[PDB]
Structure 1
Amino acid sequence: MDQKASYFINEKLFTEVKPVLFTDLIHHLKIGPSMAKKLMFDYYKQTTNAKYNCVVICCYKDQTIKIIHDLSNIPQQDSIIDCFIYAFNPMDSFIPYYDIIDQKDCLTIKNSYELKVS
C-alpha cells in the first residue's frame, strides 16, 4: 500500500519532468533494489495515461546485460528469469543528468576500506 513513494514520483514525472533513473527512489525510501523493482512494477501496474513507457534492464543475464530497445524481441535472453524496471522517461531518449546524492543513508554495500577524514 506504499503510495507514499508514488506521489513523489508523480511530481518529478509531472510538475517538473526530469526523469527518475534509480537514485530518487533510493534517496526517498531507502528500500531494497528488489523492493524498488516491485515499486516500479507497481507504478507500471497502476499507470494511468503514461506519456511514454519505460524500458527495463533484464535480470536474466547469460553473460549479457542489455537495456532493451527491441522491446517486442527477446535479445539473446530467451529463457528469461526476470527484469528490473527503471528509467521511466518522458523524452525521446533516456538520458538523465547525473548528480551527487546523499549516500551515507543510501549505500547498500559499503566500502571495504571505509573513508577516513583523518
Structure 2
Amino acid sequence: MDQKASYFINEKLFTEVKPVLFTDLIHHLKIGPSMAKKLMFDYYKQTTNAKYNCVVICCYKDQTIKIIHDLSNIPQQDSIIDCFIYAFNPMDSFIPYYDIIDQKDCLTIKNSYELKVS
C-alpha cells in the first residue's frame, strides 16, 4: 500500500518501460480492486514530473465501459457511475501485453466449481 505500491509503480514505469495496470497492483499486493483504484488515484497526485499518460475509463448506468480519449468533452456526464485510472502509460501508444497470472488468492468472485486434478 503506502510506500510500497508507489515503489512498485515507479519501478514498473521507469526501470522497465511497461504500462502499469491496477490489476497488476491487485496481483502484487493481494488487495481488492477498489483499494487498487484508490492507490492509483493516490499515486496520480503528489507527482511533479508528469512523465506518464494516465488512462481512465468511465462506467455508465448502461454498463458502457468507455476509454476516455478526448479528455475535454465526456458525453453523458450525469450518466457516469464510476471513474478511475485504468492504467499508467509512459508512452502515447498503449498496446499492453498479457501473460499467465497465478491468481492463487487474488480472486474477488470465485466460481462455484472447484478444480480437480487426477
TM-score range, shorter chain: 0.7 to 0.9
- Do 1:68 and 1:75's aligned partners in 2 also have CA atoms closer than 8 Å? no
- Do 1:55 and 1:86's aligned partners in 2 also have CA atoms closer than 8 Å? yes
Q: CA deviation at 1:52?
A: 3.1
Q: CA deviation at 1:48?
A: 2.5
More strand by share: 2
How many residues are treated as equivalent by the alignment?
A: 118
Identical columns (%): 100
Unpaired segments of 5 or more residues in structure 1?
Answer: none
Counterpart-to-counterpart distance in 1, 2:80 and 2:15: 36
Q: CA deviation at 1:34?
A: 0.9
Unpaired segments of 5 or more residues in structure 2?
Answer: none
What is the Cα-based RMSD across aligned positions, in Å? 1.8
Q: CA deviation at 1:102?
A: 1.7
Q: Does 1:112 align with 2:112?
A: yes
Normalised to the residue count of structure 1, the TM-score between the two structures is: 0.87
Q: Deviations over 1:25-59 (max 9, x none)?
A: 01211111111111000010122312132121113
Q: CA deviation at 1:23?
A: 2.8
- Do 1:61 and 1:77's aligned partners in 2 also have CA atoms closer than 8 Å? no
